[model samples]
Target: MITAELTVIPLGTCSTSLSSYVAAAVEALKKLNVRYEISGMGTLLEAEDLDELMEAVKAAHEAVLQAGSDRVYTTLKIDDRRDADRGLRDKVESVKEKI
Candidate 1:
């Protein structure tokens, strides 16, 4: 499984707030049935592979453009682990148990 966190910033928007643009991207994720969690700074997601991951990224950037953003910046952090099966909540729970 591949885990990723994406942070998308839309520039050239009329307002300072960007919740609507974010929602558009989330809609894309929902359409793909990708498991995700929204955080304050980014959205965490787990995909079956790199192809699926990049699809989500493209969907998000296109979403912002469709929403009237002239420019968009996106950062993706990916962890492709083949050692064992692990998921978003599993990793968090492991850390919590240690803490």
Candidate 2:
């Protein structure tokens, strides 16, 4: 699986009420029914292939736009998997260590 740590930043508007937008993105992610989490102001997702993950991202961005959010910028950090033991938890821990 290819897993990505995703950051969704809303631009083009000064409004600060972002919870709804975030919720929309999260809902879209959930529709994919893939492994994911909504943390801070971002999402982390894992899929068996690139096509599925990219589709999820696109859906999320569309949700953000539909929720009255302006330009939605997405930043991602992705990694290749090694079998089913890609150690997702360990990678999250490593990112936590840096923070």
Candidate 3:
């Protein structure tokens, strides 16, 4: 499994607030089969593999284009742990339990 987080921010948008574009990306993310959660910093997601992860990213990027943006900037972070099976919640809980 791969844990990933991404931010697809639109550029050349004609507005002070880009919240609508964010929603458009989220709506695109919603169509994918991946499980995700949104934090102020970015959107976290878990995909079966890198392919699925990138697909989610493309969806977000293209979504911004469809939402009316001349440019889109996507920042993606990924963690591929093959030691054992782990998930998004498990990572947080691992630290949470120690805290």
- TM-score for every candidate vs. truth? 0.92, 0.78, 0.91
Ranked by TM-score, the better of candidates 1 and 3 is 1
Of candidate 2, the 10-residue stretch with the lowest lDDT total is 81-90
Candidate 2 lDDT by residue in tens digits, 1-99: 677877767787587777777778878878884789777757877788777788788888888888787688878778876665454677778899999
Model 2: how far residue 52 lies from native, Å: 0.6
Which stretches in model 3 have alpha-carbon errors above 4 Å?
Answer: none
- Could you give candidate 3's per-residue lDDT for residues 1-99 as a string of tens digits? 789888888887767788889888988988887888998988999989888788888998899998889889889999999998889999999999999
Top candidate when judged by TM-score against the true structure: 1
- Report the lDDT of model 2 for residue 35: 86
User: Considering every candidate listed, which one attains the maximal lDDT?
Assistant: 3
CA-lDDT, candidates in order: 0.86, 0.77, 0.88
List the pairs of residues colliding in candidate 3: none
